Write an enzyme that holds these catalytic residues in place. Structure first.
Site, PDB file in Angstrom:
ATOM      1  CG  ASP A 130     -13.341   1.778  -9.204  1.00  0.00           C
ATOM      2  OD1 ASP A 130     -13.109   0.655  -8.687  1.00  0.00           O
ATOM      3  OD2 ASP A 130     -14.258   1.971 -10.042  1.00  0.00           O
ATOM      4  CG  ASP A 157       1.209   0.217 -12.651  1.00  0.00           C
ATOM      5  OD1 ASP A 157       0.535   1.094 -13.246  1.00  0.00           O
ATOM      6  OD2 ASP A 157       2.268   0.475 -12.033  1.00  0.00           O
TER       7      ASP A 157
HETATM    8  C1  LIG Z   1      -6.695  -0.601  -8.318  1.00  0.00           C
HETATM    9  O1  LIG Z   1      -7.705  -0.116  -7.411  1.00  0.00           O
HETATM   10  C2  LIG Z   1      -7.214  -0.059  -6.059  1.00  0.00           C
HETATM   11  C3  LIG Z   1      -5.874   0.425  -5.772  1.00  0.00           C
HETATM   12  C4  LIG Z   1      -5.403   0.472  -4.404  1.00  0.00           C
HETATM   13  F1  LIG Z   1      -4.143   0.934  -4.129  1.00  0.00           F
HETATM   14  C5  LIG Z   1      -6.240   0.047  -3.337  1.00  0.00           C
HETATM   15  F2  LIG Z   1      -5.739   0.109  -2.048  1.00  0.00           F
HETATM   16  C6  LIG Z   1      -7.590  -0.441  -3.608  1.00  0.00           C
HETATM   17  N1  LIG Z   1      -8.481  -0.889  -2.544  1.00  0.00           N
HETATM   18  C7  LIG Z   1      -8.776  -0.138  -1.328  1.00  0.00           C
HETATM   19  C8  LIG Z   1      -8.437   1.307  -1.093  1.00  0.00           C
HETATM   20  C9  LIG Z   1      -8.753   1.953   0.073  1.00  0.00           C
HETATM   21  C10 LIG Z   1      -9.471   1.201   1.113  1.00  0.00           C
HETATM   22  I1  LIG Z   1     -10.003   2.206   2.941  1.00  0.00           I
HETATM   23  C11 LIG Z   1      -9.823  -0.204   0.941  1.00  0.00           C
HETATM   24  C12 LIG Z   1      -9.494  -0.884  -0.281  1.00  0.00           C
HETATM   25  F3  LIG Z   1      -9.831  -2.195  -0.458  1.00  0.00           F
HETATM   26  C13 LIG Z   1      -8.078  -0.486  -4.980  1.00  0.00           C
HETATM   27  N2  LIG Z   1      -9.411  -0.934  -5.303  1.00  0.00           N
HETATM   28  S1  LIG Z   1      -9.911  -2.476  -5.246  1.00  0.00           S
HETATM   29  O2  LIG Z   1      -9.478  -3.139  -3.894  1.00  0.00           O
HETATM   30  O3  LIG Z   1     -11.496  -2.488  -5.346  1.00  0.00           O
HETATM   31  C14 LIG Z   1      -9.189  -3.403  -6.639  1.00  0.00           C
HETATM   32  C15 LIG Z   1      -9.577  -2.972  -8.100  1.00  0.00           C
HETATM   33  C16 LIG Z   1     -11.121  -3.105  -8.358  1.00  0.00           C
HETATM   34  O4  LIG Z   1     -11.537  -4.476  -8.181  1.00  0.00           O
HETATM   35  C17 LIG Z   1     -11.467  -2.655  -9.804  1.00  0.00           C
HETATM   36  O5  LIG Z   1     -12.705  -1.908  -9.806  1.00  0.00           O
HETATM   37  C18 LIG Z   1      -7.771  -3.903  -6.427  1.00  0.00           C
HETATM   38  C19 LIG Z   1      -8.928  -4.869  -6.386  1.00  0.00           C
HETATM   39  N1  LIG Z   2     -15.491  -2.213   4.404  1.00  0.00           N
HETATM   40  C1  LIG Z   2     -16.605  -2.863   3.967  1.00  0.00           C
HETATM   41  N2  LIG Z   2     -17.659  -3.086   4.802  1.00  0.00           N
HETATM   42  C2  LIG Z   2     -18.785  -3.727   4.409  1.00  0.00           C
HETATM   43  N3  LIG Z   2     -18.931  -4.199   3.141  1.00  0.00           N
HETATM   44  C3  LIG Z   2     -17.965  -4.046   2.189  1.00  0.00           C
HETATM   45  C4  LIG Z   2     -16.709  -3.360   2.551  1.00  0.00           C
HETATM   46  N4  LIG Z   2     -15.949  -3.351   1.463  1.00  0.00           N
HETATM   47  C5  LIG Z   2     -16.624  -3.973   0.470  1.00  0.00           C
HETATM   48  N5  LIG Z   2     -17.831  -4.398   0.901  1.00  0.00           N
HETATM   49  C6  LIG Z   2     -18.860  -5.118   0.092  1.00  0.00           C
HETATM   50  O1  LIG Z   2     -18.231  -6.079  -0.767  1.00  0.00           O
HETATM   51  C7  LIG Z   2     -18.681  -5.936  -2.125  1.00  0.00           C
HETATM   52  C8  LIG Z   2     -17.516  -6.234  -3.075  1.00  0.00           C
HETATM   53  O2  LIG Z   2     -16.502  -5.235  -2.988  1.00  0.00           O
HETATM   54  P1  LIG Z   2     -15.379  -5.057  -4.113  1.00  0.00           P
HETATM   55  O3  LIG Z   2     -14.710  -3.722  -3.931  1.00  0.00           O
HETATM   56  O4  LIG Z   2     -14.514  -6.288  -4.069  1.00  0.00           O
HETATM   57  O5  LIG Z   2     -16.167  -5.066  -5.514  1.00  0.00           O
HETATM   58  P2  LIG Z   2     -17.193  -3.955  -6.041  1.00  0.00           P
HETATM   59  O6  LIG Z   2     -16.697  -2.597  -5.680  1.00  0.00           O
HETATM   60  O7  LIG Z   2     -18.571  -4.358  -5.644  1.00  0.00           O
HETATM   61  O8  LIG Z   2     -17.126  -4.151  -7.624  1.00  0.00           O
HETATM   62  P3  LIG Z   2     -15.844  -3.934  -8.586  1.00  0.00           P
HETATM   63  O9  LIG Z   2     -14.616  -4.373  -7.874  1.00  0.00           O
HETATM   64  O10 LIG Z   2     -16.151  -4.858  -9.738  1.00  0.00           O
HETATM   65  O11 LIG Z   2     -15.810  -2.476  -8.982  1.00  0.00           O
HETATM   66  C9  LIG Z   2     -19.251  -4.508  -2.223  1.00  0.00           C
HETATM   67  O12 LIG Z   2     -20.346  -4.379  -3.147  1.00  0.00           O
HETATM   68  C10 LIG Z   2     -19.624  -4.155  -0.795  1.00  0.00           C
HETATM   69  O13 LIG Z   2     -21.020  -4.262  -0.578  1.00  0.00           O
END
Ligand SMILES: COc1cc(F)c(F)c(Nc2ccc(I)cc2F)c1NS(=O)(=O)C1(C[C@H](O)CO)CC1
Ligand SMILES: Nc1ncnc2c1ncn2[C@@H]1O[C@H](COP(=O)(O)OP(=O)(O)OP(=O)(O)O)[C@@H](O)[C@H]1O
Ligand SMILES: [Mg+2]
Length: 291
Positions: A130, A157
């Site tokens: 991603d 998943d």
């Molecule tokens: C499945 O991806 C994922 C699968 C994983 F195993 C993860 F640990 C994450 N999130 C994640 C990974 C490393 C750090 I340092 C901080 C985080 F927050 C995601 N990505 S995500 O948190 O942005 C997620 C999906 C995203 O919203 C879709 O674009 C789950 C909500």
């Molecule tokens: N560790 C962090 N420190 C500062 N800001 C953060 C951090 N993680 C996320 N953010 C902020 O929070 C917002 C939302 O994060 P999130 O991963 O939930 O969604 P996204 O990546 O913007 O979009 P999507 O999940 O739809 O792909 C980001 O655009 C970012 O600016």
């Protein structure tokens, strides 16, 4: 020390996405300010245990190109992923206030991305899945780090059912399951074009549109374009010839013919950017009014 829900205190909201919401919180016990991401999951307790257990390997993901991790736990109706707070935010955020990001900066960004991806693959055998502007963080110290990579298979998943209109997915990933690490290269390329032009690369801007710079497409219309129409090129003249070749090597539809981390690591654009002296912190702070 172990992270616990009642040990936190909300300060503000850093943002929200389709998958979850992240707050800027304070970990009272340590006094350390953190970024806490909340992911609401309406799933059985057994599976969430697997997720929380798979997120633990995040403690082993230590790198200057990877967002720091503090801990993961399940609270009330959602798992928490606590990480380092990046006062600079995500690149997509800085992209707005900046409108466009200079090639000089993008070169440094490209280096951090390539090294982050390389680290994840070499030391943990995992692809990001991603890569896009919002998942690239930066801070006032000038650091550029990747976040939100697929470390837990189970989480991937449970998120398989959401998406969003604008897609950074490679052509192969959009068509089937025959995709892997090369898919991340396509995303980086597209993200670079976006940050270099000032908007989602697809559909590409016309002659008249570029002249000005220097309605959204339907769901299928956009994906059909990505898969069938030729990849987004970078406007010639306003951008270096080396940088143009860089994204081109990235945006090759065929994943086997597309450049890989090894090759891009020693590409003219990177070698050149590597040597260049750029004050990212200064730029990042002035453009978003931080320092
Ligand atoms: C499945 O991806 C994922 C699968 C994983 F195993 C993860 F640990 C994450 N999130 C994640 C990974 C490393 C750090 I340092 C901080 C985080 F927050 C995601 N990505 S995500 O948190 O942005 C997620 C999906 C995203 O919203 C879709 O674009 C789950 C909500
Ligand atoms: N560790 C962090 N420190 C500062 N800001 C953060 C951090 N993680 C996320 N953010 C902020 O929070 C917002 C939302 O994060 P999130 O991963 O939930 O969604 P996204 O990546 O913007 O979009 P999507 O999940 O739809 O792909 C980001 O655009 C970012 O600016
Ligand atoms: Mg993200």
């Amino acid at each position: 020390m172990e992270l616990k829900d009642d040990d936190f205190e909300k300060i503000s909201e850093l943002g929200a996405g389709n998958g979850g919401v992240v707050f800027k919180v304070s970990h009272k016990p340590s006094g350390l300010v953190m970024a806490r991401k909340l992911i609401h999951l309406e799933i059985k307790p057994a599976i969430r245990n697997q997720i929380i257990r798979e997120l633990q390997v995040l403690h082993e993901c230590n790198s200057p190109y990877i967002v720091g991790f503090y801990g993961a736990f399940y609270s009330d109706g959602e798992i928490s992923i606590c990480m380092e707070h990046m006062d600079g935010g995500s690149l997509d955020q800085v992209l707005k206030k900046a409108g466009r990001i200079p090639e000089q900066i993008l070169g440094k960004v490209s280096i951090a991305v390539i090294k982050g991806l390389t680290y994840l693959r070499e030391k943990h055998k995992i692809m990001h899945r991603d890569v896009k502007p919002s998942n690239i963080l930066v801070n006032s110290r000038g650091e550029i780090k990747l976040c939100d990579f697929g470390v837990s298979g189970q989480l991937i998943d449970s998120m398989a059912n959401s998406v969003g209109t604008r897609s950074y997915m490679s052509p192969e990933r959009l068509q089937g399951t025959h995709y892997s690490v090369q898919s991340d290269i396509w995303s980086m390329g597209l993200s670079l074009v976006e940050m270099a032009v000032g908007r989602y690369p697809i559909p590409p801007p016309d002659a008249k549109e570029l002249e000005l710079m220097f309605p959204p497409m339907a769901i299928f219309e956009l994906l059909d374009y990505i898969v069938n129409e030729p990849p987004p090129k970078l406007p010639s003249g306003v951008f270096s010839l080396e940088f143009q070749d860089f994204v081109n090597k990235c945006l090759i539809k065929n994943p086997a013919e597309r450049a890989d981390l090894k090759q891009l690591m020693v590409h003219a654009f990177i070698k050149r950017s590597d040597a260049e002296e750029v004050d990212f912190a200064g730029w990042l702070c002035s453009t978003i009014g931080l320092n």
